[PDB]
Every structure is written in C-alpha cells, then in structure tokens.
Enzyme design. Sequence first.
Site, PDB file in Angstrom:
ATOM      1  N   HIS A  30      45.793  54.203  25.967  1.00  0.00           N
ATOM      2  CA  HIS A  30      46.554  53.579  27.053  1.00  0.00           C
ATOM      3  C   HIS A  30      47.324  52.300  26.627  1.00  0.00           C
ATOM      4  CE1 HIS A  30      42.750  51.375  27.920  1.00  0.00           C
ATOM      5  NE2 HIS A  30      43.565  50.382  28.280  1.00  0.00           N
ATOM      6  N   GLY A  71      41.925  42.651  29.135  1.00  0.00           N
ATOM      7  CA  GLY A  71      42.205  42.240  27.758  1.00  0.00           C
ATOM      8  C   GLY A  71      41.111  42.650  26.773  1.00  0.00           C
ATOM      9  N   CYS A  81      39.852  45.804  26.403  1.00  0.00           N
ATOM     10  CA  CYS A  81      39.919  47.199  25.942  1.00  0.00           C
ATOM     11  C   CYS A  81      40.093  47.291  24.447  1.00  0.00           C
ATOM     12  CB  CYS A  81      40.987  47.980  26.691  1.00  0.00           C
ATOM     13  SG  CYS A  81      40.672  48.103  28.463  1.00  0.00           S
TER      14      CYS A  81
HETATM   15  C1  LIG Z   1      39.592  47.253  37.457  1.00  0.00           C
HETATM   16  N1  LIG Z   1      40.765  47.973  36.991  1.00  0.00           N
HETATM   17  C2  LIG Z   1      41.986  47.701  37.437  1.00  0.00           C
HETATM   18  O1  LIG Z   1      42.185  46.915  38.363  1.00  0.00           O
HETATM   19  C3  LIG Z   1      43.162  48.370  36.741  1.00  0.00           C
HETATM   20  N2  LIG Z   1      42.841  49.176  35.576  1.00  0.00           N
HETATM   21  C4  LIG Z   1      43.290  48.645  34.288  1.00  0.00           C
HETATM   22  C5  LIG Z   1      42.394  49.159  33.130  1.00  0.00           C
HETATM   23  C6  LIG Z   1      42.804  48.582  31.750  1.00  0.00           C
HETATM   24  C7  LIG Z   1      42.079  47.238  31.718  1.00  0.00           C
HETATM   25  N3  LIG Z   1      40.871  47.485  32.525  1.00  0.00           N
HETATM   26  C8  LIG Z   1      39.715  46.644  32.455  1.00  0.00           C
HETATM   27  C9  LIG Z   1      38.688  46.874  31.542  1.00  0.00           C
HETATM   28  N4  LIG Z   1      37.547  46.172  31.471  1.00  0.00           N
HETATM   29  C10 LIG Z   1      37.388  45.179  32.340  1.00  0.00           C
HETATM   30  C11 LIG Z   1      38.342  44.826  33.332  1.00  0.00           C
HETATM   31  C12 LIG Z   1      38.139  43.778  34.265  1.00  0.00           C
HETATM   32  C13 LIG Z   1      39.095  43.477  35.191  1.00  0.00           C
HETATM   33  C14 LIG Z   1      40.283  44.198  35.244  1.00  0.00           C
HETATM   34  C15 LIG Z   1      40.514  45.224  34.371  1.00  0.00           C
HETATM   35  C16 LIG Z   1      39.551  45.578  33.388  1.00  0.00           C
HETATM   36  C17 LIG Z   1      40.989  48.585  33.318  1.00  0.00           C
HETATM   37  O2  LIG Z   1      40.125  49.027  34.055  1.00  0.00           O
HETATM   38  C18 LIG Z   1      42.389  50.683  33.229  1.00  0.00           C
HETATM   39  C19 LIG Z   1      42.296  51.481  32.090  1.00  0.00           C
HETATM   40  C20 LIG Z   1      42.120  52.845  32.239  1.00  0.00           C
HETATM   41 CL1  LIG Z   1      41.919  53.826  30.818  1.00  0.00          CL
HETATM   42  C21 LIG Z   1      42.071  53.444  33.481  1.00  0.00           C
HETATM   43  C22 LIG Z   1      42.204  52.662  34.612  1.00  0.00           C
HETATM   44  C23 LIG Z   1      42.359  51.282  34.500  1.00  0.00           C
HETATM   45  C24 LIG Z   1      42.469  50.477  35.730  1.00  0.00           C
HETATM   46  O3  LIG Z   1      42.205  50.945  36.821  1.00  0.00           O
END
Ligand SMILES: CNC(=O)CN1C[C@]2(CCN(c3cncc4ccccc34)C2=O)c2cc(Cl)ccc2C1=O
Lengths: 305, 305
Positions: free
Chosen positions: B41, B143, B145
């Site tokens: 991603h 940040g 990932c």
């Molecule tokens: C909570 N998520 C979001 O608001 C947006 N969100 C972005 C994202 C990439 C970054 N990330 C995070 C990863 N770990 C902690 C995080 C803490 C706070 C915000 C984001 C975090 C995700 O979850 C993501 C990646 C993928 Cl493969 C599939 C879906 C997502 C996604 O939904």
Amino acid sequence: SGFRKMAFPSGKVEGCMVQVTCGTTTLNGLWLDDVVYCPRHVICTSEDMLNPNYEDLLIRKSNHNFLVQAGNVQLRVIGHSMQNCVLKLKVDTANPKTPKYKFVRIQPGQTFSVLACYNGSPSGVYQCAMRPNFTIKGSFLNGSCGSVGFNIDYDCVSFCYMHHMELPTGVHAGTDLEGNFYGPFVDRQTAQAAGTDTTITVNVLAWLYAAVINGDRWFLNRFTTTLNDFNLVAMKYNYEPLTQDHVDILGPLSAQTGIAVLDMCASLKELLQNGMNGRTILGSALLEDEFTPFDVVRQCSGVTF
Amino acid sequence: SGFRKMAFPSGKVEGCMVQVTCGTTTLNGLWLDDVVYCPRHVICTSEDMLNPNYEDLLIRKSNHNFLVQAGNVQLRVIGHSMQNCVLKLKVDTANPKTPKYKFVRIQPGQTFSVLACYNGSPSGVYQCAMRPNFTIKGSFLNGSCGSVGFNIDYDCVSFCYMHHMELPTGVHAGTDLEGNFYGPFVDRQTAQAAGTDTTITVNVLAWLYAAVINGDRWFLNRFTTTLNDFNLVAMKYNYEPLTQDHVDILGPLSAQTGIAVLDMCASLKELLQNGMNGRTILGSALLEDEFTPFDVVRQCSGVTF
Ligand SMILES: CNC(=O)CN1C[C@]2(CCN(c3cncc4ccccc34)C2=O)c2cc(Cl)ccc2C1=O
Ligand SMILES: CNC(=O)CN1C[C@]2(CCN(c3cncc4ccccc34)C2=O)c2cc(Cl)ccc2C1=O
Ligand SMILES: [Cl-]
C-alpha cells in the site's frame, strides 16, 4: 492506538557488551572507548563475598588475570582501577561501536531499559523503574551481573544502572556507572533486605492519562481535589506524595485530554477507595506505576532514535 | 528471580530498517541483502485505499518512482515486484548489516518482538502475541507500517510479521514476510472487524508453571480433571480449547515442577471460578496469556524454588 510497556531500541548498547573473567568468576562488562566497566565483585570467590576487602583482593591481581572477550576476540587488559563498587579495566583497543554516551544517576520513579546479558551476550530487553525503595523488579539469573540499564535522549545513550545482586525477595540491586549503589545496599553476601515499597503516584497519574488518550474513560468523574487532601489519601494507601513538580510535569497531558491534574487525582482517590469493580484500565486490573509522564508522551507521539 | 515481558535485543533488526517513499506516501522497509521489503500500500493514496487495484497501480511505476533512504544515504532501486501484499524493491547495494535470517509464518498463540519504527527510524521495542483471532494488540501510530515482528533464538533472526493496518477496535493486522495476511483481512479500507477473541490457554498454563518455578503455589489444589471436562469449563470463560499437542508441549514444565498438566488445568479451572481474592501471580492480578511454554523455559531458572 495501543499502549505497551516499551523499551528503547537496544542496538547501541549491544555493541558494548563484553564478557569479563577473573579466575573462576565470569560476568558482563560494558566496553566504552578503551575502558571496560564491570562490578568489582568479579575478583571475589564465593568465600570472599562473605567479607571482602576489595583493595586487598585487587592488589594481588595483574592485568593478565582479567580475561576480556568481545565476541570471539580477546581484548588485552593494560590497566585496572577501582571506582566505588565498579572495576575499570583499561584495554588496548577503543570500542569502534562506542555510541555517544553519558553516565547519569537516576531518581526513584524514573524508568529505564535493561539489556539482560549472560557471558557478554545479550539475551533480552525489558523496561522497568527505580522503585522508591531503590530496588528494581528485574528478571535476572546468576550470570547477569554487569547487565546495564539505560535511556536514549536524542542520539545519546544515558547509562544509569549496572546489575550487582538479587535480594531475598527476588528483587534486584545495583549501582550507577560510577559504582555508587542505589539504596542502602552493599556488595557482600550478608543479611540485606528491601525496605517497604510505595507506589509511584505521578506515574500512575501518567498511565491514567495514557488510558484516556486510548479511549478508556469509565474512571473519570466530575470531582476535583486539593493537593493536600489528595496526599492525605495517598499516604493512607502507601502511595508516594505528589508534589507541585509532579503537577507541573503532567501539564501537557492535562491539556491534551482536557482533564486537570487534580481532577485526575480525584479519579485516583475513588479508584483507591473503591477498587475497579470488575473493570480493567489498559488491560490491567492493577494501577500501573512504571510509565513516567515523559514515557506516555513519547509513546503516544512516536519519538525515534 | 523475577518474570518480565521480555523482548529480544533489537540491534540486528535496527540495522535493517529503512524509509520507503512513493510520491506522497511514506512508510518503513526491511533491507536484507539487496532487497527492501515493504507493504504494497506504499503505492496508494488515501483515495486508492477503498478498492485499490494493486497490479494497475504498480504497472504505472518505474524503479526511480521509489525513494529508499537508509540513514542519511539514498539507495538506488534497480528492480521491483509484488509478492502477495508485499512489495520487493531490488536495490544496488547489499545491506552490510544483514544478519543471519529466516522468514517464518507463525500460528496463533506464538509470541514475538516488535520494533516499532517511523520514517525508517526505530522508536521502541515490545513483546506481543498473535491472538487466536489473528490480530495483535500492538502500540502503533500512523507512519508505523512496515515495522516488523521477529524472534532471535540463537544468532538467527526469524522475521514473522510486517505491520499493515489498525482495525476499528484499535488492534492490528499484518502479514508474514511473504505478504500473506494473518487472518481474514485485506489491505483495503473496506468495512473490516476483528472476530471475537479468546484467551490462549496453553500460554496461561505455561505462566502458571513459571509462577511455581519462581516459588509460588497458593493457586494449586488437590484436584485433577479430564481434558474434555477442562475444555467444557474453559470455553465458558472464552478460553481456547486445550489440545493433546498443548499437553505434550507442557511436558518439560510439568517434569520440572512435579505438577501434572491436568492437575495444573484443575488449578486454572478454580482460578477462573474464584478469581484471585486480593492475590497476584507474578505481579499480576489477571491471568497472563502472552508467554509461551518456550518463553517460560528461556526466561526461568532450570531450578524450581
Ligand atoms: C485506523 N485506520 C485509518 O483510519 C485509515 N487506514 C490507514 C492504514 C495505513 C496506516 N494505518 C495505521 C496502522 N497502524 C496504526 C495506525 C494508527 C492510526 C491510524 C492509522 C494506523 C492504517 O490502518 C490502512 C492500511 C491498510 Cl493496508 C488498510 C486500511 C487502512 C486504514 O483504514
Ligand atoms: C541470590 N544471591 C545469592 O544467593 C548469592 N549472591 C550472589 C550475587 C552475585 C550473583 N547474584 C545474582 C544476581 N542476580 C540474580 C541472581 C539470581 C540467582 C542467584 C544469584 C543472582 C547475586 O546476588 C551477589 C552479589 C553481591 Cl554484589 C552481593 C551478594 C550476592 C549474593 O548474595
Ligand atoms: Cl508458530
């Protein structure tokens, strides 16, 4: 999201760990520049520990009596001297992996990372705190002496602890990197005990802020308290007194969540007097005191090293 | 003595962390030999994340669209390919700090260390477990990932997890180092949820054996149980079923303490019915399930107190 007991990355310290041997006794040393630092009891046998005269045991030692091993390489000892309860072994090679460092003496309530070592080889890293009774609740077996505690401030490693012994209750005692013990302890196999411990109040408050930042708010209430009334309550439960310094230090967290420090103190009083009533805070049924206000800010903001 | 949630020393993994950038998106990569591994991603904008077509997004990229930074040095990308949910970027320089390593896919209940990173820079290290619902309860911010999970038994690093996302409950989902997700998750911003989680029974049993080794037996009783009766009671408290595999795996801990596995199961049954009644086990008021039988053997003394 999430909140874990997190240690500093240990790589800068791993590159300093060596094995120190003096006769039959083997333990860990910290190699910084051209000096290896280790507990002075490396020169003692089990019989010497009962009542050692360290200056007297040391005078009988030459440089070649100390075997220092860094990985699979033997370092040559060219000098030796004692500073308090630490032995300093001068070697012929400066450690090429020596990071930017400082030796700092910490106060009770301060947290640090421990890199537990056996035979000069790192086995694990964990976070812990200097208890108010100056002991640490570590995880150490025989062979772990010389393991160090540290923090990282920017790119600088601040060494604060070197492991020396285990007390009868299973808790641990050691020194700063200048060989001064934390607590009323001595480096001798004699009757010693940890004093009655207390809970680190400013740290519990900081952890309650980390729970709020993470969505746990059931314990918040409409009440506030004075600093004096809170301390009368806290003294009843073997909690350390909260000072105006502690209140000032929690200011940033008080502003981030909208909960004043004496408002969080009112939540803590109710928790002490009533318990959690079947509930948990951050996956714990006990009030956690091994996260400082700085640790909470650092973990919730992603500071790197 | 003592028992801590202990992580492996992270130095071998710190020397592999890099920053990967593709346009406006930035995350972490793992540099081993001449390949940088990162979540696929990295090629998505926030818009793309709902129903991304990774093959269509990737074909529009050249090697020079990927910016890889290792410390203060820019690495040159000379190739790229996708394997499941991971992107593999071939670089012109082999990592001189590449440790001895393996890629391993773990099962629920297995534990590992996480080196949380931001912008290719390590911030902290903590221990956690693959939950039965295939999520991990980590501490990760936006940040993070590309941060990885690993074990370092002996001198070989076994990489088992790469971080991809945070679910609505604040728990985390990711893949093995071949890009296969753990759990029924997809790298899409579509509606996804963690399934109902359960307690890792074999791990709780292992930690009860740790408490006995360290000198505590208050929770034991004069009873035993059949494996089937234990599972009928356990599943009523949302505990994972205990299999014959788990019973065999607990054999060494059983022999070291003299307490049969089914006798320890009777103790656990009683703890679930009665709670702790003001007592703690290894400094905890809850039954801990993130220490495996292997972790207990590695940390504890081989001599029971
Ligand atoms: C909570 N998520 C979001 O608001 C947006 N969100 C972005 C994202 C990439 C970054 N990330 C995070 C990863 N770990 C902690 C995080 C803490 C706070 C915000 C984001 C975090 C995700 O979850 C993501 C990646 C993928 Cl493969 C599939 C879906 C997502 C996604 O939904
Ligand atoms: C529990 N200790 C003992 O029975 C003997 N004992 C040996 C020793 C040196 C090694 N060591 C240990 C250090 N950490 C964990 C240990 C776990 C299990 C056994 C030993 C451990 C000590 O405590 C020590 C050093 C000093 Cl400066 C002063 C006194 C002693 C001492 O009393
Ligand atoms: Cl596994």
